[PDB]
Amino acid sequence: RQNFAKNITTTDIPKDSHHFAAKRSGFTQTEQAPFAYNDVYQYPKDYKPWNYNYKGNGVLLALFLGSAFSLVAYERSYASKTGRYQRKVQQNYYQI
Amino acid sequence: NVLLSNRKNLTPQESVQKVINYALLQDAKQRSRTLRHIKASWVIPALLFTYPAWYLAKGAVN
Amino acid sequence: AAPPAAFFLYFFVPDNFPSAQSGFRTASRNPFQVQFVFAYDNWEYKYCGQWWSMGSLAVNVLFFVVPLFLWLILQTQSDQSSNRDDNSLTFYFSNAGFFFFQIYTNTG
Amino acid sequence: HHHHAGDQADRVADKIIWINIQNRIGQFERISAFEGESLLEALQRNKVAGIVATCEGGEDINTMLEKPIDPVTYGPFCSSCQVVVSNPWRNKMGNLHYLEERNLVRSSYPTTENSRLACCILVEKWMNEMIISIPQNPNSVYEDNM
Amino acid sequence: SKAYYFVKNFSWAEVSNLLCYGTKYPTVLNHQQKVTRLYRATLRRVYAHQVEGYKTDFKQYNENITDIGKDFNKMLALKPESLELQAYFKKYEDLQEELFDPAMIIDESRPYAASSGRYYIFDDYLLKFDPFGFYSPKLLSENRPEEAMPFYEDYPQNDSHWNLWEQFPEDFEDSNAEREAILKSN
Amino acid sequence: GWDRPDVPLSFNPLYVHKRELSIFDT
Amino acid sequence: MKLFQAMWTRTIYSIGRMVRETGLALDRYGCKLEQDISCYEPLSRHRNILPIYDLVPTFYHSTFIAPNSSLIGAVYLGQNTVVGYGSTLRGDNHAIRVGHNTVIGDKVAISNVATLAAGIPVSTNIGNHVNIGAGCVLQSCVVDDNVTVGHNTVILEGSVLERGSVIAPNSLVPAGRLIPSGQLWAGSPVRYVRDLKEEEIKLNLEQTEQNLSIGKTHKSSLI
Amino acid sequence: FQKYPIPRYLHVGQWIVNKNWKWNTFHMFFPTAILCFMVWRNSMISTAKPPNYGEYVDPQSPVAPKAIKY
Amino acid sequence: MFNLNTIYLSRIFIEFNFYFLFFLFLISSIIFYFSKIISIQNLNQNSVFNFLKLANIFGILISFFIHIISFWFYCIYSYNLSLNIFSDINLYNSNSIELLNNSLLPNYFKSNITIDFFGLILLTLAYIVGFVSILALDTRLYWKNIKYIFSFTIFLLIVYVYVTVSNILLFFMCYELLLIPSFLIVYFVSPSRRAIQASLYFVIWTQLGSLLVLIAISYIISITNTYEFNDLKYFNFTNSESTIIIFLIFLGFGFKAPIWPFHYWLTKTHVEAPSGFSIYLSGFLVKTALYGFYKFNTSIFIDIDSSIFIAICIMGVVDSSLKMWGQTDLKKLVAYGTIQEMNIIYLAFCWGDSCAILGGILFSATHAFLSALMFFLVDCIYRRYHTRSLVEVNGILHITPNLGLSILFMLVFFSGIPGTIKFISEFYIFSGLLEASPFICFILMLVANVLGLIGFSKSWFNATFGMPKKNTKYLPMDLSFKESYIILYCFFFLFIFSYFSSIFF
Ligand SMILES: Nc1ncnc2c1ncn2[C@@H]1O[C@H](COP(=O)(O)OP(=O)(O)O)[C@@H](O)[C@H]1O
Ligand code: FES
């Protein structure tokens, strides 16, 4: 069974208390005692459960930087393979 | 200390909410203290006994 | 047919940790389904030699003699490879024990 | 069972299965048992003499007490829990398992055609007021005295 | 009526019984039940061949149904043990066999029809299911504890167990404030 | 016309398994 | 950086434990060599105050704690708070906080549950001017100020009792239930009883004050 | 078929209409066209074609088919 | 432009990755043993188990990452090494390069590290399959059996030493060392009651195979008083000894890599074992038999006809694929698929050191990932519906559709669409077999890729489609992120390893 704590310290859980009001008055001689906490979860109202709610740029930036590094590294490797300091660009290129 | 502080000037709902919040904060502090004590209990044996174990294994094998 | 009264069920080791995924909601099982689940594992033959005629004797014999048929076909095609100088069915030894892409270096 | 909300609990007296016993010394005994239990457990809880029970019922996974007997079971291990069951109940018990018969016919003391290993019996409703006899069972090993 | 004539490994005798009578075992039916069921099957087949047919003739259809009605009215008043009734049963079972079509039109309202069970209908159990509280409100307490029971957390949908120790904000002040205050007091 | 109720759950009748599933019909 | 202090504290504690054990073993060996049997005395091992490693019970000098009682773990007690004879407060799991001018009866057992849901404190909290009768059992509950609980009452986890409410003797408050302010409740499936009056509240307060005074007198006589 | 309720928790696609489908169509179509343009631009490097009308392949030219010197 | 720096990078990475893993294991073990007295879970929030879990996961991942870079180094190294001897055409010069030893750590077991392509493929498979299996064992580990969180790190260390030695004795010892952890996992972690006898079957068959291999190893060691694969180049075995050795090693390694007459243990063990260990057993453990056999097959000159071994392997394929129709348990069906493709791979090593080994090497990894995916899908179904029998669960689509989509895509990949490595391995092996034996190739192709495929597809399609009407109050939710990412990674690895360097294979 799970044994982790739920009252976290990093942030406060988003919740509302207007839903599920307690009775607290006008009790009869047969009904049960009212509940105590009654708070319910509150969603950011811009959340879509059917897709990733990802709004960052880190993944795209990392992939783009990796691809650019791959390109420049290949350029350096090709220049080194031909025994040149930089690629010698021909004046005309043809279909392979 | 919220519990020891007088709360008769509040409504019962405010008093119980204040007590609950104070209890939750103190619970979090106690949890942090216990967790760091147990972390130290984990950390000490590694520093004390990692080198003798490696010495034993190295002397056995090579 | 009346539902089975005695049949093999599921069993778990002592002090087993239950699986509690998706809220841990387990339903009652169907006796016929559980009976089918555990029937084949516990099925056994009744008398010696019952297998040969169980089903089709000719088909069972053919299944029994399959490895010999494969060996004979391989022998015939090895005859075909021998006279055409094709790849024979032998453990070829042309690398003198040197492995496929193996580092062969020295120290000192 | 079958209960409805607000119902009261049943009485243990109405759920008792009665076993009538002739001792090794010719005296009569009355024993209380319950359904879903083995005869050996009831006999040992009621402290009935004449049974040695060297192996204490056998293994714990593939036992003889499960209603369909599992094929890869090992069966009884000591054959020292023998009882003699009277004709109607013994006839209702049915034919013996081959492993149980092998252990029964191999005992050092004489047996009968009504012999039956106690740990291989699961107590049922129809076993109420069943008559059995327990002559003394043989000893096997050194630790039996300890 | 379930139209599982061909989707079960039936013999012809079972299929013929199901076509002539609404059961595989016509021996458990009364005399009147058998007569009425055979009459209904015969009329259904004649309609399927002489009204919804290829080149349908209404006059011939009326003649045939009149003759069949006369014959079945004779059949009803006979006795079950009579051989003439058995001959009538044999004749109309042969008629059902002779008009048998491997391409019968099956009404779409029948249980084993061609377009039956094309959609999975969700019951109220699935409609009211919401583990996380986006569509239906979810208590932070996760349940309402009934009396005569302890208060226990619900089993989560994902029991991963791949969790760390409790995380705290950096530079979290966690001194024993109560103990320090009391010790200062005395 | 007529206010039809929702699609009935009888559209998917539940099977009851009146007979045993033979291992020779696997 | 505080991990270093925790490591040093644990090392010091372990060295002290080693030294104490070695001393006791040497004393027992001296017993034997001397033909002494004093160290074979089977005296009671019960401790009035039992602190878990870093959880030490903390209370004022004005608190009365019976020598029969047992406070274990993190137990915090306010001023002029009395614990009766044979009571047990186990805060090994989570702390137990008791306010001031609070009376705890003789056979009261207070403990806490392992875990609870979000937003529910798992510790036990008892306010000020609170009377708890003898034989009560309390588990992870919040009791506000000026609350009286009768004898042989059971209060379960997640229960909240608001200020000024009264619980009749021989009752049970089900887990996770709220009992509103200024009301009397009775029964094992506890049920509502008519709202309290001024005279009843005054009598309850006077009885609590008299019990506190009697406890203080008993503490003074004991010393 | 007559419409029937679908549970909210299920991420299934029965009778779904997205009110913002025009912008989503735009933002799925145009980048797709750009990606396909880049793929086609890369692939035209390795595309062959027979000589046009009125042209002949000189057998002694370098582009003409070749044999192997053993 | 290849120089000494790449050589020393490769060697240092090979040795230091092992020492990284070993120091992780030692530190975690010391923390586990000295933190508490009993060394069982404390069942609270601050249990050491938590830390241990992370540690183990951490290490494997990190080691795998290092391994990847390490692996790449080897490739380049090996490539250039060949070149350094291919272009040495002058009769006066010869490649005479002698390396030094690292001054930080000692050579484990006083041996010089040597590595090959297939050994590093095996190590990579160990890393990935161990990661997947340990991810699929969180729920099984609890109070009093958390220690078995350490099993996969031990497996990694043993397989590392197995693949990085030229000592035939240490080779055999590392092969033998793998049994105790496996038996312990099946015995103490499996929830099913029938797993107690299944572990005994596993032990007895695997140990009979190990005994045969031991007899062959003792033969080789006693006849040639040496422990190096190199020295076998200077000693010749007669016809009788060669025949005895080849028969012994073939039968012994076919006990573990299940040949036709010996797969009862594998079927029982997969049916009864926990899902994570089943993933490890099909994905990686059986491959350990292919490696060792290959080595002992390549170091000896055998002058026998391989027709008997080829026939045994083909009989295994035919027998396993003909039995797929009559399976209702999905796990047993996956086990039979494992048997057929393991026998197909084992066939490729029946021609010695010829080019047939490349297809087998690739198809070993292909089967590793396919079997891991199939057993993970079976585990997901079992944890969702509490059953893995076709008569009890169907209509996995229309409720939790992601699992059904995964099943269908797994079926496609198993069928072998020409875009993946399954098609490549089939092409290799079938081209070679068609040249070696046309009618045999056609028979094997028809039996494996039609009849077995039809049975597999029937049993899997029937579970995916239908109407889940029975118990709507207990119907489960769809896949979690962990399962989705694991399945996606299996698919991605197949598709992208279809693009590996062609210098190898
Ligand atoms: N498990 C089975 N084994 C053999 N035959 C079966 C099995 N299940 C169904 N059948 C055949 O298919 C038919 C199914 O009919 P059924 O759906 O039970 O009709 P009903 O619901 O009216 O009884 C039966 O008549 C039987 O002959
Ligand atoms: S007690 Fe041993 S056989 Fe019954």
Coordinates of C-alpha atoms in Angstrom, one line a residue, chain I residues 42-385:
Chain I
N42 CA 10.1 -0.5 7.1
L43 CA 6.7 0.1 5.4
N44 CA 6.8 3.8 6.1
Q45 CA 7.6 6.9 4.0
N46 CA 11.3 7.1 5.0
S47 CA 12.3 3.5 4.1
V48 CA 15.8 2.9 2.7
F49 CA 14.1 0.9 -0.1
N50 CA 13.0 4.1 -1.8
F51 CA 16.6 5.2 -2.1
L52 CA 17.8 1.8 -3.1
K53 CA 15.2 1.7 -5.9
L54 CA 16.4 5.0 -7.3
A55 CA 20.0 4.0 -7.0
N56 CA 19.6 0.8 -8.9
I57 CA 17.5 2.5 -11.7
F58 CA 20.0 5.4 -11.8
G59 CA 23.0 3.3 -12.1
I60 CA 21.7 1.1 -14.9
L61 CA 20.6 4.1 -16.9
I62 CA 23.8 5.9 -16.4
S63 CA 25.9 2.9 -17.1
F64 CA 23.9 2.3 -20.3
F65 CA 24.6 5.8 -21.4
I66 CA 28.3 5.4 -20.8
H67 CA 28.0 2.0 -22.6
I68 CA 26.6 3.7 -25.7
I69 CA 29.6 6.0 -26.0
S70 CA 31.9 3.1 -25.1
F71 CA 30.2 1.0 -27.7
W72 CA 30.7 3.6 -30.4
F73 CA 34.4 3.8 -29.5
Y74 CA 34.9 0.1 -30.0
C75 CA 33.3 0.2 -33.5
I76 CA 35.7 2.8 -34.7
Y77 CA 38.6 1.0 -33.0
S78 CA 37.8 -2.3 -34.6
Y79 CA 37.3 -0.7 -38.0
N80 CA 40.7 1.0 -38.0
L81 CA 42.4 -2.0 -36.5
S82 CA 41.4 -4.1 -39.6
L83 CA 42.7 -1.3 -41.8
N84 CA 46.0 -1.2 -40.0
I85 CA 46.6 -4.8 -41.2
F86 CA 44.9 -4.6 -44.6
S87 CA 47.1 -1.8 -46.0
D88 CA 50.4 -3.1 -44.6
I89 CA 51.6 -4.3 -47.9
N90 CA 55.4 -3.6 -47.5
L91 CA 57.3 -6.7 -46.6
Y92 CA 59.6 -4.9 -44.2
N93 CA 57.1 -3.3 -41.8
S94 CA 54.5 -5.0 -39.5
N95 CA 51.9 -3.6 -37.2
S96 CA 53.7 -3.9 -33.8
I97 CA 51.8 -1.8 -31.2
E98 CA 52.0 -2.6 -27.5
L99 CA 49.8 -0.8 -25.1
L100 CA 50.1 0.1 -21.4
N101 CA 47.9 -0.4 -18.4
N102 CA 45.8 2.1 -16.5
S103 CA 47.3 3.2 -13.1
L104 CA 44.0 3.8 -11.3
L105 CA 42.3 0.3 -11.1
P106 CA 43.5 -3.3 -11.3
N107 CA 42.4 -5.7 -14.0
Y108 CA 39.5 -7.7 -12.6
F109 CA 40.4 -11.4 -12.2
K110 CA 43.9 -10.7 -13.4
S111 CA 42.9 -10.8 -17.1
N112 CA 43.3 -8.6 -20.2
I113 CA 40.1 -7.2 -21.6
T114 CA 39.2 -8.2 -25.1
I115 CA 35.8 -7.4 -26.8
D116 CA 34.0 -8.3 -30.0
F117 CA 30.9 -7.0 -31.8
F118 CA 28.5 -9.8 -30.7
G119 CA 29.6 -9.5 -27.0
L120 CA 28.9 -5.8 -27.0
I121 CA 25.5 -6.5 -28.6
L122 CA 24.8 -8.9 -25.8
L123 CA 25.9 -6.3 -23.2
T124 CA 23.6 -3.7 -24.8
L125 CA 20.7 -6.2 -24.8
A126 CA 21.4 -6.9 -21.1
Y127 CA 21.3 -3.2 -20.3
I128 CA 18.1 -2.4 -22.1
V129 CA 16.2 -5.6 -21.1
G130 CA 17.3 -5.2 -17.5
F131 CA 16.1 -1.7 -17.4
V132 CA 12.7 -2.7 -18.8
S133 CA 12.4 -5.7 -16.5
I134 CA 13.3 -3.8 -13.4
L135 CA 10.7 -1.2 -14.4
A136 CA 8.2 -4.0 -14.6
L137 CA 8.9 -5.3 -11.1
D138 CA 8.0 -2.4 -8.8
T139 CA 4.7 -3.9 -7.6
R140 CA 6.1 -7.3 -6.9
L141 CA 8.8 -6.1 -4.5
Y142 CA 7.5 -5.4 -1.0
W143 CA 7.9 -6.3 2.7
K144 CA 10.6 -9.0 3.3
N145 CA 11.7 -9.5 -0.4
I146 CA 13.0 -6.0 -1.4
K147 CA 16.6 -7.4 -1.6
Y148 CA 15.9 -8.7 -5.1
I149 CA 16.0 -5.1 -6.3
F150 CA 19.7 -5.8 -6.6
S151 CA 19.4 -8.7 -9.1
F152 CA 19.7 -6.9 -12.4
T153 CA 22.9 -5.0 -11.4
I154 CA 24.4 -8.4 -10.5
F155 CA 23.3 -9.7 -13.9
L156 CA 24.9 -6.8 -15.6
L157 CA 28.2 -7.3 -13.8
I158 CA 28.3 -11.0 -14.5
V159 CA 27.5 -10.5 -18.2
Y160 CA 30.1 -7.8 -18.5
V161 CA 32.8 -10.2 -17.1
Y162 CA 31.3 -12.8 -19.5
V163 CA 31.8 -10.7 -22.6
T164 CA 35.1 -9.1 -21.7
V165 CA 37.4 -12.1 -21.2
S166 CA 39.6 -14.3 -23.4
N167 CA 39.8 -16.9 -20.6
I168 CA 37.7 -19.9 -21.5
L169 CA 37.5 -20.9 -17.8
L170 CA 36.2 -17.6 -16.7
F171 CA 33.9 -17.7 -19.7
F172 CA 32.3 -21.0 -18.4
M173 CA 32.2 -19.7 -14.8
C174 CA 30.4 -16.5 -15.8
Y175 CA 27.9 -18.6 -17.9
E176 CA 27.3 -20.8 -14.9
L177 CA 26.9 -17.9 -12.4
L178 CA 23.5 -16.8 -13.9
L179 CA 21.4 -19.6 -12.4
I180 CA 21.1 -18.7 -8.7
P181 CA 19.6 -15.2 -9.1
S182 CA 17.1 -16.5 -11.7
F183 CA 15.9 -19.3 -9.5
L184 CA 15.7 -17.0 -6.5
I185 CA 13.6 -14.4 -8.4
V186 CA 11.2 -17.1 -9.6
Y187 CA 11.0 -18.7 -6.1
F188 CA 10.6 -15.6 -4.0
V189 CA 9.0 -12.9 -6.2
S190 CA 6.4 -14.9 -8.3
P191 CA 2.9 -14.5 -7.0
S192 CA 1.4 -17.7 -8.6
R193 CA 1.4 -20.8 -6.5
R194 CA 2.4 -23.0 -9.5
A195 CA 5.7 -21.2 -9.7
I196 CA 7.3 -23.3 -7.0
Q197 CA 7.4 -26.4 -9.2
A198 CA 8.2 -24.3 -12.3
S199 CA 11.4 -23.1 -10.6
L200 CA 12.4 -26.7 -10.0
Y201 CA 11.8 -27.6 -13.6
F202 CA 13.8 -24.6 -14.7
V203 CA 16.7 -25.5 -12.4
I204 CA 16.8 -29.2 -13.4
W205 CA 16.7 -28.7 -17.2
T206 CA 19.1 -25.8 -17.2
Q207 CA 21.5 -27.7 -14.9
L208 CA 21.4 -30.8 -17.2
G209 CA 22.4 -28.5 -20.1
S210 CA 25.1 -27.0 -17.9
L211 CA 26.4 -30.5 -17.0
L212 CA 26.8 -31.3 -20.7
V213 CA 28.6 -28.0 -21.3
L214 CA 30.8 -28.8 -18.3
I215 CA 31.7 -32.2 -19.7
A216 CA 32.8 -30.6 -22.9
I217 CA 34.8 -27.9 -21.1
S218 CA 36.5 -30.4 -18.9
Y219 CA 37.4 -32.4 -22.1
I220 CA 38.9 -29.3 -23.7
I221 CA 40.8 -28.2 -20.6
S222 CA 42.3 -31.6 -19.8
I223 CA 43.3 -32.4 -23.4
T224 CA 44.9 -29.0 -23.9
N225 CA 46.3 -27.7 -20.6
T226 CA 45.4 -24.1 -21.4
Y227 CA 42.7 -21.5 -20.8
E228 CA 43.2 -19.1 -23.8
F229 CA 41.2 -19.2 -27.0
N230 CA 44.5 -18.4 -28.8
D231 CA 46.3 -21.6 -27.8
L232 CA 43.6 -23.7 -29.5
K233 CA 45.1 -22.6 -32.8
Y234 CA 48.2 -24.6 -32.1
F235 CA 46.5 -27.9 -31.1
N236 CA 44.4 -30.2 -33.3
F237 CA 41.5 -32.4 -32.1
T238 CA 40.9 -35.8 -33.7
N239 CA 37.7 -36.7 -35.4
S240 CA 36.3 -38.5 -32.3
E241 CA 37.1 -35.7 -29.8
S242 CA 35.7 -33.1 -32.2
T243 CA 32.5 -35.0 -32.7
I244 CA 32.1 -35.5 -28.9
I245 CA 32.7 -31.9 -28.2
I246 CA 30.4 -30.5 -30.8
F247 CA 27.6 -32.9 -29.8
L248 CA 28.0 -32.0 -26.1
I249 CA 28.1 -28.2 -26.6
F250 CA 25.2 -28.3 -29.1
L251 CA 23.0 -30.3 -26.7
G252 CA 24.1 -28.3 -23.6
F253 CA 23.5 -24.9 -25.1
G254 CA 20.3 -26.1 -26.7
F255 CA 18.9 -27.0 -23.3
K256 CA 19.0 -23.3 -22.4
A257 CA 18.4 -21.9 -25.8
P258 CA 15.4 -24.2 -26.2
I259 CA 15.8 -26.8 -29.0
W260 CA 12.8 -28.9 -30.0
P261 CA 12.8 -31.8 -27.4
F262 CA 13.7 -29.5 -24.4
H263 CA 11.2 -26.6 -24.0
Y264 CA 8.9 -27.9 -21.3
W265 CA 10.8 -26.0 -18.7
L266 CA 10.6 -22.8 -20.7
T267 CA 6.8 -23.1 -21.2
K268 CA 6.2 -23.8 -17.5
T269 CA 8.5 -21.0 -16.3
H270 CA 7.0 -18.4 -18.6
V271 CA 3.5 -19.4 -17.6
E272 CA 4.2 -19.2 -13.9
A273 CA 7.0 -16.6 -13.6
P274 CA 6.5 -12.9 -12.9
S275 CA 6.2 -10.6 -15.9
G276 CA 9.4 -8.7 -15.5
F277 CA 11.5 -11.8 -15.1
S278 CA 9.7 -13.3 -18.1
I279 CA 10.8 -10.3 -20.1
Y280 CA 14.4 -10.8 -18.9
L281 CA 14.3 -14.5 -19.6
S282 CA 13.1 -14.3 -23.2
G283 CA 14.8 -11.1 -24.0
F284 CA 18.3 -11.7 -22.7
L285 CA 19.0 -14.9 -20.7
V286 CA 18.5 -17.4 -23.5
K287 CA 20.9 -15.4 -25.7
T288 CA 23.7 -16.3 -23.3
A289 CA 23.5 -19.8 -24.8
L290 CA 24.0 -18.4 -28.4
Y291 CA 27.1 -16.5 -27.5
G292 CA 29.0 -19.2 -25.7
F293 CA 28.2 -21.9 -28.3
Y294 CA 29.4 -19.5 -31.0
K295 CA 32.7 -19.1 -29.2
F296 CA 33.2 -22.8 -28.7
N297 CA 32.0 -23.5 -32.2
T298 CA 34.5 -21.1 -33.7
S299 CA 37.6 -22.1 -31.8
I300 CA 37.6 -25.8 -32.8
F301 CA 37.9 -27.5 -36.2
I302 CA 35.0 -29.9 -36.6
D303 CA 34.8 -32.3 -39.6
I304 CA 31.2 -33.5 -39.2
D305 CA 28.0 -32.9 -41.2
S306 CA 25.7 -30.4 -39.6
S307 CA 22.6 -31.9 -41.1
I308 CA 21.5 -33.5 -37.7
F309 CA 21.8 -30.2 -35.9
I310 CA 20.0 -28.3 -38.7
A311 CA 17.2 -30.9 -38.6
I312 CA 16.8 -30.6 -34.9
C313 CA 16.6 -26.8 -35.1
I314 CA 14.1 -26.9 -38.0
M315 CA 12.0 -29.5 -36.0
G316 CA 12.0 -27.0 -33.2
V317 CA 10.7 -24.3 -35.4
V318 CA 8.0 -26.4 -37.0
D319 CA 6.8 -27.9 -33.7
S320 CA 6.7 -24.5 -32.0
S321 CA 4.9 -22.8 -34.9
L322 CA 2.3 -25.6 -35.4
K323 CA 1.2 -25.3 -31.7
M324 CA 0.3 -21.6 -31.8
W325 CA -3.4 -22.0 -32.9
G326 CA -4.4 -24.1 -29.9
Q327 CA -3.3 -21.6 -27.3
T328 CA -5.8 -19.6 -25.3
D329 CA -3.3 -18.3 -22.7
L330 CA -1.5 -15.3 -24.2
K331 CA 1.7 -15.8 -22.2
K332 CA 2.1 -19.4 -23.5
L333 CA 1.6 -18.1 -27.0
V334 CA 4.3 -15.5 -26.5
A335 CA 6.5 -18.3 -25.1
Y336 CA 6.0 -20.5 -28.2
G337 CA 6.8 -17.5 -30.5
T338 CA 10.0 -17.1 -28.4
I339 CA 10.8 -20.8 -29.0
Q340 CA 10.3 -20.6 -32.7
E341 CA 12.5 -17.5 -33.2
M342 CA 15.2 -18.8 -30.8
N343 CA 15.4 -22.0 -32.9
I344 CA 15.6 -19.9 -36.1
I345 CA 18.5 -18.0 -34.6
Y346 CA 20.2 -21.2 -33.3
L347 CA 19.9 -22.6 -36.9
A348 CA 22.2 -19.7 -38.2
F349 CA 25.1 -21.0 -36.1
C350 CA 25.1 -24.4 -37.8
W351 CA 27.6 -23.5 -40.5
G352 CA 30.6 -22.5 -38.4
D353 CA 32.2 -19.1 -38.9
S354 CA 30.6 -18.4 -42.3
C355 CA 28.5 -15.3 -43.1
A356 CA 25.4 -17.0 -41.5
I357 CA 26.3 -15.6 -38.1
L358 CA 25.4 -12.0 -39.1
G359 CA 21.8 -12.8 -39.5
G360 CA 21.7 -14.6 -36.2
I361 CA 23.5 -11.8 -34.4
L362 CA 20.9 -9.3 -35.7
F363 CA 17.9 -11.5 -35.1
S364 CA 19.0 -12.1 -31.5
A365 CA 18.5 -8.4 -30.8
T366 CA 15.3 -8.4 -32.9
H367 CA 13.9 -11.2 -30.8
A368 CA 15.1 -9.5 -27.6
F369 CA 13.0 -6.4 -28.3
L370 CA 10.0 -8.2 -29.8
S371 CA 9.8 -10.6 -26.8
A372 CA 10.2 -7.8 -24.3
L373 CA 7.4 -5.9 -26.0
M374 CA 5.0 -8.9 -26.2
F375 CA 5.6 -9.9 -22.6
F376 CA 5.1 -6.3 -21.5
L377 CA 1.8 -6.2 -23.4
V378 CA 0.7 -9.4 -21.7
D379 CA 1.7 -7.9 -18.3
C380 CA -0.4 -4.8 -19.0
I381 CA -3.4 -6.9 -20.0
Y382 CA -3.0 -9.1 -16.9
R383 CA -2.8 -6.1 -14.5
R384 CA -5.8 -4.4 -16.2
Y385 CA -8.3 -7.3 -16.5

